[PDB]
RNA sequence: GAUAGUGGCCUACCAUGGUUUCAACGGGUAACGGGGAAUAAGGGUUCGAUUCCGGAGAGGGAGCCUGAGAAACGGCUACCAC
RNA sequence: GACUUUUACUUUGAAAAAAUUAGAGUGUUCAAAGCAGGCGUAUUGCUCGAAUAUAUUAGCAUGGAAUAAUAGAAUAGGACGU
């Protein structure tokens, strides 16, 4: 079905940026 | 000779053998993969705060029949729904719903023999107030 | 194949002492073995012994008295410095009172107390007590 | 061939008078590199021109005097030597093999083949990767 | 013991303790050296020559009676072959097994034994290529083996 | 750093200043001048910490702004002026003279000097060279540049300099069997006689020295300074005479200087 | 050529090299590096943002004036986001 | 000047910032600390201190020649010659 995931420094920082922006 | 090399120019094989065999431990594999930073509900912290969504009458059947008093919480830092035990209050009279709760860890290993659960967390504070001093009647709880 | 010879020699010596015998036949021989047994013979863990020539590499017949408890080799010959001796004599000997960790220094092969007195060091072969 | 380039190959400031005709068609400069390293014969009597020579160039030798073993000679006027050694891990109380390559300039007063043991000496930065220069050769 | 097999077989010649010449042997050193040269020009290998010298002529060991071995003497006379004897017999046996495999395509056992023999050839050829008794251009190949034996 | 520094934190001080680590937060960073930063001694430390004349920092400033303190004949007005080895400090109103000589423990010590000895000053020649219009000159350990030396003066030669005119009075060439003080490194502050000179071309040279009590030690050539002859130093030596003692000898001497 | 100065640092013209199971290259880091910290009979295990040294940055990128020294944010200029 | 198998391994010395560590001294009232202080005629002042130790690998210098590598006249294209 679906393959796995391997996240970057980039993917961490962009998802954290999106969540921080939505929180603020 | 004990199934491992003993040559004096063989430090490389020994340390590669150790780095391959330390992945069979438990604490090493949790620790160097960032397990707690990804999936554990506290995110690798000693406490957490959250908002009570429900009070739960969980049941422990066998071999001890008891009515476990628990609380389903949604944590503030994560958006994570976690059930947790609350001790010493038969009435839960210090707890209502939609209150803020400081939770810690709790090491009860529930059994598989009678589907009795050990939830992972105990309630330390409700609405800022020490739950112990509530139950020991040393403070009063502001009720919102 | 046969990689160390002093190891096989002390293996045979120790087995024959465990059985309580009086003599051993070591095949082959080495200069290192002869010097080692001279170190043994100086304190007298063994009596006299004897070389045998066959033009190839000699055999040795050893008379062993009763005094050997255990001898052995340290098979990777570790480099040791001066204070490092105090590690190995804390590991291998049965007491601080006796026993001889033996070293191979540039001034010959001898027990550790002589290398304390001569103030040298080197590598390590084995232990006798 | 000496004059292989788009520019004239000469030593700098070394002048041959057209009026006074000498026996040799070029007066030629050389020097010793010190530390008791003997200059070779083909440096003195040869006809090559090398900026980066330690004997006929503007390059001194000072710092680290090292040895090594040639691996490649596939590239123009410089080679790659490979010096290897033993690194000590203290936990297992023992050693392991480890090597490094070094690109090093070689003067054309030397003929050097793969496998030879070469003594080199440190000079100033010659290229992106080179900081050494061949000062003595021992044949395998 | 016994690479490419499992046996622990010990069966060899002893060598007597006496270095020097036998007491009862009463021939000349040049006589037996000329005998060696005669049998070499006959076309024999040094193993065969030593066998015939101790069977018929009572010459016990070549390095006992003379100061040189048989191979030193054939090297001193310009009679050494292009390859040493053991590598030659290994290539000969490999050519035999190769021809047998070219006839019968199903003998997996001959295939396995051929692989073992070629392994032994490569190890011994690395030894001879190291000590410069064989040129570094030399390499065991199939049609090269058919040229070298046939 | 985006430019040259101006501070020196109190833990980063040279340990041979003996500054306490809880007085304040900094140490006086010595200025540019005749000595190296690491091995200098600024005037504030010599007035306050060793001679006890000034209690504060600004008392140092008050004394130095009255022109009492002369460093090698000239009046200095700097709080952190790098007074270093072999230098002469003169207090006119106190009528005292000091030569900065290392103690055996490796720090500068107080050392009283007569007026005749205060007139001159030694210095290790660190480079000799031929400057413009072909005039030879020497450069000493403190940065003094003297034109027209004796041609026999080579590198490492100790030169006597009379502080009035600043000329070369006489000199000592670096020969084996001379009296030698030691300038840097572990063996600092000892007085001995050099056995010979070990020579490593392309690297560092070494010197074997043998003291008054026949102990032998080895330093590099940089740390060497020549004073005089056997029993004939050109300057007056401090007490202890650069003789390195074991701790048991020192302990026995201390309890032997205790007899009520 | 440029630089304070070697140097593919860059440019023109030539070659076809260079690194790699003694682990290159890619990936991850809740990785600033070290002096050090905690804990042990020994050997080790785990931390070091944090008082000292060195590095880097002043919302993100870039460029620069002045000056011995800055690609400076309690200096300037432009874009991007507020 | 000409010579001039070498390395691995050990011995010693120098090198290894202070702070921290171990440890010497010292009645901070004791201590954790600090590097102070101690004596007299205290009336015109004497006075010891602020040690020592820690290759932990890389580099440097030196002694050793056991151990473990490698080479050294085999088509002689070998060696010492007043």
From Swiss-Prot, chain A:
Record's subcellular location: Cytoplasm; Nucleus, Nucleolus
Superkingdom of the source species: Eukaryota
Binding partners and assembly: Interacts with RIO2.
Function text: Required for 40S ribosomal subunit synthesis. Required for normal export of the pre-40S particles from the nucleus to the cytoplasm. Its subcellular location and association with pre-40S subunitshifts from mixed cytoplasm/nucleus to all nuclear in RPS19 disruptions, suggesting it acts after the ribosomal protein.
Note from the entry: Present with 1390 molecules/cell in log phase SD medium.
Family: Belongs to the TRAFAC class translation factor GTPase superfamily. Bms1-like GTPase family. TSR1 subfamily.
Name assigned to this protein: Ribosome biogenesis protein TSR1
From Swiss-Prot, chain B:
Coarse class of the protein's main subcellular location: cytoplasm
Pfam family, one: Ribosom_S12_S23
A biological-process GO annotation: maintenance of translational fidelity
Subcellular location per the Swiss-Prot or TrEMBL entry: Cytoplasm
InterPro entries in alphabetical order: NA-bd_OB-fold (IPR012340), Ribosomal_uS12 (IPR006032), Ribosomal_uS12_euk/arc (IPR005680)
Keyword Nucleus included in the entry's annotation: no
PTM annotation (3,4-dihydroxyproline): residues: 63
PTM description: Hydroxylation at Pro-63 affects translation termination efficiency. The stereochemistry of the 3,4-dihydroxyproline has not yet been determined.
GO molecular function, one term: structural constituent of ribosome
Family matches, as CDD domains: Ribosomal_S23
Keyword tags: Cytoplasm, Hydroxylation, Isopeptide bond, Ribonucleoprotein, Ribosomal protein, Ubl conjugation
The keyword Ribosomal protein belongs to this UniProt entry's keyword annotation: yes
Cross-link Glycyl lysine isopeptide (Lys-Gly) (interchain with G-Cter in ubiquitin) per UniProt, renumbered positions: 55
Entry GO CC: cytosol; cytosolic small ribosomal subunit; ribosome
Subunit-structure text: Component of the small ribosomal subunit (SSU). Mature yeast ribosomes consist of a small (40S) and a large (60S) subunit. The 40S small subunit contains 1 molecule of ribosomal RNA (18S rRNA) and 33 different proteins (encoded by 57 genes). The large 60S subunit contains 3 rRNA molecules (25S, 5.8S and 5S rRNA) and 46 different proteins (encoded by 81 genes).
Miscellaneous note of the record: Present with 10600 molecules/cell in log phase SD medium. There are 2 genes for uS12 in yeast.
NCBIfam families referenced in this protein's UniProt entry, alphabetically: PRK04211.1, uS12_E_A
Family listed: Belongs to the universal ribosomal protein uS12 family.
Protein name: Small ribosomal subunit protein uS12A
Species of origin: Saccharomyces cerevisiae (strain ATCC 204508 / S288c) (Baker's yeast)
Gene name tied to this protein: RPS23A
UniProtKB/Swiss-Prot annotation, chain D:
One GO term (biological process): translation
Gene3D superfamilies the UniProt entry points to: 2.40.50.1000
Gene name as annotated: RPS11A
Function: Component of the ribosome, a large ribonucleoprotein complex responsible for the synthesis of proteins in the cell. The small ribosomal subunit (SSU) binds messenger RNAs (mRNAs) and translates the encoded message by selecting cognate aminoacyl-transfer RNA (tRNA) molecules. The large subunit (LSU) contains the ribosomal catalytic site termed the peptidyl transferase center (PTC), which catalyzes the formation of peptide bonds, thereby polymerizing the amino acids delivered by tRNAs into a polypeptide chain.
Sequence position, cross-link Glycyl lysine isopeptide (Lys-Gly) (interchain with G-Cter in ubiquitin): 10, 41, 51-52, 74, 91, 100, 128, 136
Homology family: Belongs to the universal ribosomal protein uS17 family.
Keyword RNA-binding: yes
A GO term, aspect molecular function: structural constituent of ribosome
Protein name as catalogued: Small ribosomal subunit protein uS17A
Organism: Saccharomyces cerevisiae (strain ATCC 204508 / S288c) (Baker's yeast)
Swiss-Prot record, chain F:
Crosslink position(s): Glycyl lysine isopeptide (Lys-Gly) (interchain with G-Cter in ubiquitin): 61, 133, 160, 167, 173, 178, 210, 232
Subcellular location: Cytoplasm
A single MF term (Gene Ontology): RNA binding
Major site of localization recorded for this protein: cytoplasm
GO cellular component, one term: cytosol
S4 RNA-binding domain boundaries: 41-104
Positions of post-translational Phosphoserine modification: 31, 246
Keywords: Cytoplasm, Isopeptide bond, Phosphoprotein, Ribonucleoprotein, Ribosomal protein, RNA-binding, rRNA-binding, Ubl conjugation
PROSITE patterns cross-referenced by the UniProt entry: RIBOSOMAL_S4E (PS00528), S4 (PS50889)
Modified residues (Phosphothreonine): 114
Gene3D superfamilies xrefs: 2.30.30.30, 2.40.50.740, RNA-binding S4 domain
The organism's place on the tree of life at top rank: Eukaryota
Protein's GO biological process: cytoplasmic translation; translation
HAMAP family: Ribosomal_eS4
Purpose: Component of the ribosome, a large ribonucleoprotein complex responsible for the synthesis of proteins in the cell. The small ribosomal subunit (SSU) binds messenger RNAs (mRNAs) and translates the encoded message by selecting cognate aminoacyl-transfer RNA (tRNA) molecules. The large subunit (LSU) contains the ribosomal catalytic site termed the peptidyl transferase center (PTC), which catalyzes the formation of peptide bonds, thereby polymerizing the amino acids delivered by tRNAs into a polypeptide chain.
Family: Belongs to the eukaryotic ribosomal protein eS4 family.
Additional facts recorded: Present with 573 molecules/cell in log phase SD medium. There are 2 genes for eS4 in yeast.
Protein name, as recorded: Small ribosomal subunit protein eS4A
Organism the protein comes from: Saccharomyces cerevisiae (strain ATCC 204508 / S288c) (Baker's yeast)
Gene name tied to this protein: RPS4A
């Amino acid at each position: 079905g679906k393959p796995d995931k391997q996240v970057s420094k980039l993917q961490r920082k962009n998802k954290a940026k999106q969540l921080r922006a939505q929180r603020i | 000779g004990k199934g491992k090399p003993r040559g004096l120019n063989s430090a490389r094989k020994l340390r590669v053998h150790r780095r391959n065999n330390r992945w069979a431990e438990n604490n090493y594999k949790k620790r160097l993969l960032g397990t707690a930073f990804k999936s554990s509900p506290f995110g690798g912290s000693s406490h957490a705060k959250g908002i009570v969504l429900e009070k739960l009458g969980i049941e422990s059947k066998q071999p001890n029949s008891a009515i476990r008093k628990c609380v389903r919480v949604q944590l503030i830092k994560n958006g994570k729904k976690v059930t947790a035990f609350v001790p010493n209050d038969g009435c839960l009279n210090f707890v209502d719903e939609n209150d803020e709760v400081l939770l810690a860890g709790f090491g009860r290993k529930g059994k598989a023999k009678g589907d009795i659960p050990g939830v992972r967390f105990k309630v330390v504070k409700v609405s800022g107030v020490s739950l112990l001093a509530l139950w020991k009647e040393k403070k009063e709880k502001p009720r919102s | 194949t046969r990689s160390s010879v002093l190891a096989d020699a002390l293996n045979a010596i120790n087995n024959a002492e465990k059985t309580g015998k009086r003599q051993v036949l070591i095949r082959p021989s080495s200069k290192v073995i002869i010097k080692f047994l001279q170190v043994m013979q100086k304190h007298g863990y063994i009596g006299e012994f004897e070389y045998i020539d066959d033009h190839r590499s000699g055999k040795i017949v050893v008379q062993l008295n009763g005094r050997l408890n255990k001898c052995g080799v340290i098979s990777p010959r570790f480099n040791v410095k001066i204070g490092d001796i105090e590690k190995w004599t804390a590991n291998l000997l049965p007491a601080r009172q006796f026993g001889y960790v033996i070293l191979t220094t540039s001034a010959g092969i001898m027990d550790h107390e002589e290398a304390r007195r001569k103030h040298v060091s080197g590598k390590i072969l084995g232990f006798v007590y | 061939t000496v004059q292989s380039e788009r520019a004239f190959q000469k030593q700098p400031h070394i002048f041959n008078n057209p009026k006074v005709k000498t026996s040799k068609r070029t007066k030629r400069w050389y020097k010793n590199a010190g530390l008791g390293f003997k200059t070779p014969k083909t440096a003195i009597e040869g006809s090559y021109i090398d900026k980066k020579c330690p004997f006929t160039g503007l390059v001194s030798i000072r710092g680290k005097i090292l040895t090594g073993t040639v691996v490649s000679t596939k590239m123009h006027r410089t080679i790659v030597i490979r010096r290897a050694y033993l690194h000590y891990i203290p936990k297992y109380n023992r050693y392991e093999k480890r090597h490094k390559n070094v690109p090093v300039h070689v003067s054309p007063a030397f003929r050097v083949q793969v496998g030879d043991i070469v003594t080199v000496g440190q000079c100033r930065p010659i290229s992106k990767t080179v900081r050494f220069n061949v000062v003595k050769v021992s044949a395998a | 013991g016994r690479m490419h097999s499992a046996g622990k077989g010990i069966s060899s010649s002893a060598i007597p303790y006496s270095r020097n010449a036998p007491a009862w042997f009463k021939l000349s050193s040049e006589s037996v050296i000329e005998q060696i040269v005669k049998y070499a020009r006959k076309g024999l290998t040094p193993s065969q020559i030593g066998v015939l010298l101790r069977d018929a002529h009572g010459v016990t060991q070549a390095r006992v009676i003379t100061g040189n071995k048989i191979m030193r003497i054939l090297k001193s006379n310009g009679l050494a072959p292009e390859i040493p004897e053991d590598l030659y017999y290994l290539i000969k046996k490999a050519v035999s097994v190769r021809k047998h495999l070219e006839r019968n395509r199903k003998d997996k056992d001959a295939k396995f034994r051929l692989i073992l023999i070629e392994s032994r050839i490569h190890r011994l050829a690395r030894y001879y290529r190291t000590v410069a008794v064989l040129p570094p251009n030399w390499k065991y190949e199939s049609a090269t083996a058919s040229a070298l034996v046939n | 750093a985006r430019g040259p520094k101006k501070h020196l934190k109190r833990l980063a001080a040279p340990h041979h200043w003996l500054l306490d680590k809880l007085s304040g937060c900094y140490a006086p960073r010595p200025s540019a001048g005749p000595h190296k930063l690491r091995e200098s001694l600024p005037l504030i430390v010599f007035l306050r910490n060793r001679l006890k004349y000034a209690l504060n920092g600004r008392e140092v400033k008050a004394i130095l702004m009255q022109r009492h303190v002369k460093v090698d004949g000239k009046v200095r007005t700097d709080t952190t002026y790098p007074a270093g080895f072999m230098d002469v400090i003169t207090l006119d109103a106190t009528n005292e003279n000091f030569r900065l000589v290392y103690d055996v423990k490796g720090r500068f010590a107080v050392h009283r000097i007569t007026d005749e000895e205060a007139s001159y000053k030694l210095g290790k020649v660190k480079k000799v060279q031929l400057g413009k219009k072909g005039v030879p000159y020497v450069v000493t350990h403190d940065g003094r540049t003297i034109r027209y030396p004796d041609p026999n003066i080579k590198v490492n030669d100790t030169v006597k300099i009379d502080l009035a005119s600043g000329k070369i009075t006489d000199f000592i060439k670096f020969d084996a069997g001379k009296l030698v003080y030691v300038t840097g490194g572990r063996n600092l502050g000892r007085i001995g006689t050099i056995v010979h000179k070990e020579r490593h071309d392309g690297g560092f040279d070494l010197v074997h020295i043998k003291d008054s009590l026949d102990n032998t030690f080895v330093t590099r050539l940089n740390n060497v300074f020549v004073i005089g002859e056997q029993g004939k130093p050109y300057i007056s030596l401090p007490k202890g005479k650069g003789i390195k003692l074991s701790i048991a000898e020192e302990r026995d001497r201390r309890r032997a200087q205790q007899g009520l």
